[PDB]
Amino acid sequence: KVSITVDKDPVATSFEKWAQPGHFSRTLAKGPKTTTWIWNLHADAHDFDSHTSSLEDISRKIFSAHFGQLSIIFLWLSGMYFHGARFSNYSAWLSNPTAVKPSAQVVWPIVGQEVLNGDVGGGFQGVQITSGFFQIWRASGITSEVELYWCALAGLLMSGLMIFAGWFHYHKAAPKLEWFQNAESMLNHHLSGLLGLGCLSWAGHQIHVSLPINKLLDAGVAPQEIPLPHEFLVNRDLMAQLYPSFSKGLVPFFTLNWSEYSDFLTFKGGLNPVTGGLWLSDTAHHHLALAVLFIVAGHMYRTNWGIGHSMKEILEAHKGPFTGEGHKGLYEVLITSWHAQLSINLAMLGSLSIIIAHHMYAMPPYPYIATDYPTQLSLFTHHMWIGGFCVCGAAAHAGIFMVRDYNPAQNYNNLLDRVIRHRDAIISHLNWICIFLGFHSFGLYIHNDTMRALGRTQDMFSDTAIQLKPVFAQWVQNIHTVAPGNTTPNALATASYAFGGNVVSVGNKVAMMPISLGTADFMVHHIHAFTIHVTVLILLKGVLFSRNSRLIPDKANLGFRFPCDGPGRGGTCQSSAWDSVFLGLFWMYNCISVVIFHFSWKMQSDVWGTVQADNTVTHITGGNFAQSAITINGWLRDFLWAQASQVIQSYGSSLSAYGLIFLGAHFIWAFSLMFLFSGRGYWQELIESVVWAHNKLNFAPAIQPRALSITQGRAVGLAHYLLGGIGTTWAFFLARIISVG
């Protein structure tokens, strides 16, 4: 029976434990004999599985932590809306979106930092923003700072509601483990209620607010002259002017005469010629169809009324001759381990973020986002980074599950056991494929560099020489170009003009034009494959060898996160799943850096640009990608050296902050190498000398100073490495794109 059961007043709200750091942990509650205690407090703050053996306690803590996170996110959103309402040039941008640069942040004039308040436009000077909030609001139909103030108020109220809910559901009414372990009910409610009703409500909002307001805005009406959303809601005649099918009502809906709504529910495709974004009348239909799909999908599982599926039955029924027992035990694993669920959900969320980055650039969804090149680049790279981090976290928590919550008794001759029983084949084959891809993807660049340096330019892998044409990608592009009318008969235009078609231009500037793939694109795609495969190798190898290996037969006893197992067996450094995550994070950084560089150069060289009166488009770099992106020297000179000019010549401008952050990110990246190339013994001995100096003056801390643990040194090195690298790319990208757009 799916039912609600809670414990009343399980934990008393009191500050007694606020003054007892480490209370959650038995080893830490004693006190800080050394400085390692301080670091352990933070490393084990949110490891609820190591505080108690009670799954109920862990689940309640997780529920309340989620409520706190939602309150933080709502506060973030309310802050963004309030800054848009008070410290922005949103009205001027609405008046002339193609001339004034969006800005919603202003700095104080203290030490000359007021230079960062650049001339964005609209009589306003602030910090140009690249998050796309202006376009989000324009699509939502917001035309005033009053509406943004009300948005901020709603965000603040929801943040308060979420924090109250977290406190209430930890200290007043904490649900029980039987409540938590309702996968069928939770999936039904999420799918139908959360997703389906969310997209249904958004479709209603688009049909009643966004569509007419944006129709008038594209018609050129002034934001002040556009009527209000409640006017549209209550005046069916006013709406029936813009969309003449509202005079028909909901009778077509309930009689299945849905064609009557083709005026505002259509499958046009392409991009709005005025704004350069997707048709909001297409987005409304998209969200309505998604609502139907999700509400139907949320009726699949059994809750209380017999109708539905049991995922245990499905999984146990899915087995074959190559898999023995198949998916047996997985339902229990997933309703008894939060780490397995976290790994699955993180992998899916990161992959979704990557998919979102690709689609949101090729099919600009918001009005006036496509010609806002800083926004496009920033969003693409941002979501790429989020996806990479989520994937690495998925690997980490898969390893944590394998070490902590994996029980061989419950997993016998199922898929998990069989994977562990042939892990050597998997890793050896992935090793071979990684080496093959590395060779035949990077040695090609090396071959080209050597041939261009030797003057044998006819021996290179180039479009003007030996060719490596991505015929399959070009074939798919041709399919998608010709689909309108043939394989998608009732669509007027292609899904994206990147596959092919006519240039979409807004404000004498390209919004989206065909993206042509050649030898350089073939090369960079195979390098992307290489990097993804190597990252997968590192992460999967760590996960599979988390518990045991030929080297360390008892590794689950050492744990998921241990430094080593000593200098024996030749040396057993970094042999833990945690260290696999550490190296795989390095490699994820490599992969995403190459991906975002590919995006930046390709889009600045073959998509983005200004279109002349001759209908010809001149790009930001002008075709340098086809003949330069085939050599590492080409990348070093025509991309890094060439495009770093904007950020290195930003002093004295409003991008001087980008220049300074460029240098500081370089500093942090280099500073990471001190932790990464070094070990703990040297720093402990240096601390011994420094402590002698302190003792010579008859004083020294009661908390004995210690060098960072081996794992913590690796973690600090990795964190500084990632911060420095990503910050360098951040400053470089933003300075370049805000200078040339």
């Binding site: 390692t36 241990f562 070990g679 703990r680 013994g681 402990q684 001995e685 081996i710």
Partner: protein, 74 residues
Amino acid sequence: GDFLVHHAIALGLHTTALILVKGALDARGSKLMPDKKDFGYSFPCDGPGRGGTCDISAWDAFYLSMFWMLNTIG
């Protein structure tokens, strides 16, 4: 500018000397491994006991100074 780069050079020389002198003087023994002369000059480590003993050799001090010497000559 010459003044500032000269003091950068002073920092580099002093830090390279710091690493090298510490390696030389702690080569025979420290409070972490008080019997280092028994293990010699270029042993890998002493294990994860006592907090971890990565790079606890005088060879490691050389290895770590070489990074700094390259920095300073750069």
